[PDB]
Ligand SMILES: CC1CC[C@]2(CO)CO[C@H](c3ccc(O)cc3)[C@H]1[C@@H]2C
């Protein structure tokens with residue numbers, strides 16, 4: 001789980 | 011003077 | 021199967037300028053002398069907000085979308101502070117002796133003394149900014165440099181999960197080569213001889229090693245401040261930090 | 266002056282001629298590895314290499330035209346990047362291995378003998394693999410190593426402008442090498458960039474290695490030589 005993941009995924 | 015200094019002067 | 025390679029130099033430049041993130045403000049409040057806690061809160065709050073716009077910028081860098089999620093993540097984790105820093109140095113170019121963190125947060129080196137150990141980092145950023153203004157760095161060259169950092173910094177640390185041997189990343193190197201081509205085009209277009217083109221290409225890329233050095237020093241300084249836990253860092257900022265140490 | 270009046274060919278010969286020798290380690294194979302002994306081998310080797318490196322620097326065109334103070338600073342900044350670029354170069358034809366000395370070739374598995382060291386070995390092994398992919402030439406290697414000496418401390422100290430004119434001469438020399446090898450103009454600028462971008466990774470590894478070395482100094486695993494200590498303390 002990473003904030004980066006959802007920011008990238010949008 | 012440091013070691014490097016004198017080795018550079020040699 | 022990547023649009024990036026089909027772009028002409030003009031198209032590459034245009035796409036990169038179009039990708040640029042906005043300039044953000046710091047939280048207004050005229051209350052002066054900053055304290056250590058105040059300054060760090062301001063700088064980390066800012067960087068946290070810049071990070072969100074950096075992700076959007078990254079996704080608009082030709083060739084970045086073609087990578088897997090995990091590769092995108094690895095590249096951003098490696099390069100985020102270098103990218104914030106070169107951005108900062110760029111913004112600060114036309115204010116010699118000062119760092120333009122935001123339009124309403126213009127700091128001199130004396131103000132770096134507010135935070136223990138920060139002035140060293142301030143001094144390196146200011147030297148980089150003078151170096152850029154002394155080279156007459158252009159906006160078009162800058163966006164090329166910033167994208168090179170995104171794609172280059174983490175590229176040699178794609179190691180296989182077991183055995184940890186270097187996975188070769190042909191796509192990324194091809195895009196990097198396209199950006200190099202684009203930089204040379206800009207220099208030719210500005211009227212430089214071939215010799216001046218190659219000389220200037222080298223000068224600009226050598227600065228990226230200084231920018232790497234500053235990122236590593238800043239990363240250690242950041243980690244030091246979170247250990248003393250003066251400032252509360254956003255979870256995003258902590259995760260980016262945690263990717264290094 | 267002198268350095269600025271060299272032909273590209275003359276630059277290459279000068280740099281080639283100045284190369285230091287490859288030293289042997291005191292590795293005794295009848296001596297089981299421990300964290301303390303491996304660290305002792307590696308730092309004793311580094312210590313001896315520094316003496317040759319200091320005398321190599323004197324022979325890099327332009328270097329002795331700098332003040333003694335500037336020479337000291339350049340070497341203090343770049344010494345570990347230079348040892349590391351030499352290491353990776355030496356290791357290039359031994360995939361999976363770091364050739365610290367001809368009698369000391371180490372695996373990543375061997376690096377695990379020292380805490381925190383394996384992540385540094387991995388970065389060095391990856392750099393060696395990159396050199397292999399690019400087919401780095403000896404003439405390109407000596408240029409890059411000289412670029413590191415002159416570039417690494419240049420923005421953290423006029424004669425500073427002298428340093429950049431010599432750097433430009435070395436750039437000119439790399440291009441000459443590439444034109445002579447048959448590369449097109451496009452290929453020449455592209456390989457030039459590829460070579461200078463690895464300096465960013467070399468800096469990174471040097472940064473990391475310096476923190477690892479310092480953590481070993483504080484842990485008192487093995488006695489550090491006086492020169493190595495001074496080279497290390499120049500970074501903090
Ligand atoms: C992200 C940073 C946080 C705090 C610092 C010292 O701990 C000082 O600020 C640096 C910074 C902040 C915002 C930027 O846009 C660029 C660098 C950089 C540096 C680590």
Ligand SMILES: CC1CC[C@]2(CO)CO[C@H](c3ccc(O)cc3)[C@H]1[C@H]2C
Nearest residue numbers: 307308310311348349352474477478
């Ligand atoms: C000078 C050094 C001593 C011990 C190390 C562990 O911290 C591993 O060895 C490194 C080294 C030694 C000799 C070389 O030619 C290159 C790197 C480097 C350091 C990372």
